[PDB]
Amino acid sequence: MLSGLNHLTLAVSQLAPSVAFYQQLLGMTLHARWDSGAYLSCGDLWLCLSLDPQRRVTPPEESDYTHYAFSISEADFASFAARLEAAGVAVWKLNRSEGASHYFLDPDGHKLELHVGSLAQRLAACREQPYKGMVFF
Amino acid sequence: MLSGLNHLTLAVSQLAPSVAFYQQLLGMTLHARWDSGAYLSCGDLWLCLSLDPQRRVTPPEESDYTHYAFSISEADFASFAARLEAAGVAVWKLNRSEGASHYFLDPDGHKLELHVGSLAQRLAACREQPYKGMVFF
Ligand SMILES: Nc1cc(-c2ccccc2)no1
Ligand SMILES: Nc1cc(-c2ccccc2)no1
Ligand SMILES: [Mn+2]
């Protein structure tokens, strides 16, 4: 059976600015780099940046809702969002759901999110106020 | 700071076949389903399937290398891969450039992977068989 996410791999158009974004701006740990990629960690997450000449710098209106959310504590959320804002990182959505969320773009337009709250927290809120058509299992 | 992937959200074009793929075929746990999405877990991974009219069924030659790998044990890897093959699940890559992996597509062409091994194990393997120009930190 499957036991979790093993790794997330993001195709990148330019390796250096992507390493700078994930390591220096977002604070992830850089473990290795090679001519066409890098390995970083963020808590348990194994992130791979893969240099790919097929990656387009993609405006958010031109990509679907697929996105990658990173955990942060409530206490740290506002200062991290302010850090991204200072760095000029673009926002692609405003938060309208439960739990703090900041929706931001990576240099290639990958859709990212900072989120505070677990699946258990979300399910508890949904049980009290179910979405349209919502069924629990 | 950031610690871990909070959740992975995949945009899907048809909710029912996608839920069936992740729950029935891949064995993930379905927690809730509503008219426009579903919440599943795979170990400690929170997966959200989000119905998105913008999602296109995308052939693998039309998308970049961005992909999502799920952990599986050495004992279960081959029989799970063979069952996906026998079920007609499409593939997108054959060459094992990052260890023991099986590369397959979801119904919308999201690039998925079964992988055996941790980041620490991949780094150890790379010390002996490094990618071109590899540096370790
Ligand atoms: N139960 C179930 C099987 C599948 C499937 C999807 C694509 C290809 C082959 C099988 N999806 O759900
Ligand atoms: N065939 C079928 C439909 C469903 C369903 C479950 C929860 C919510 C909406 C639909 N489960 O099986
Ligand atoms: Mn999200």
Ligand SMILES: [Mn+2]
């Ligand atoms: Mn991979």
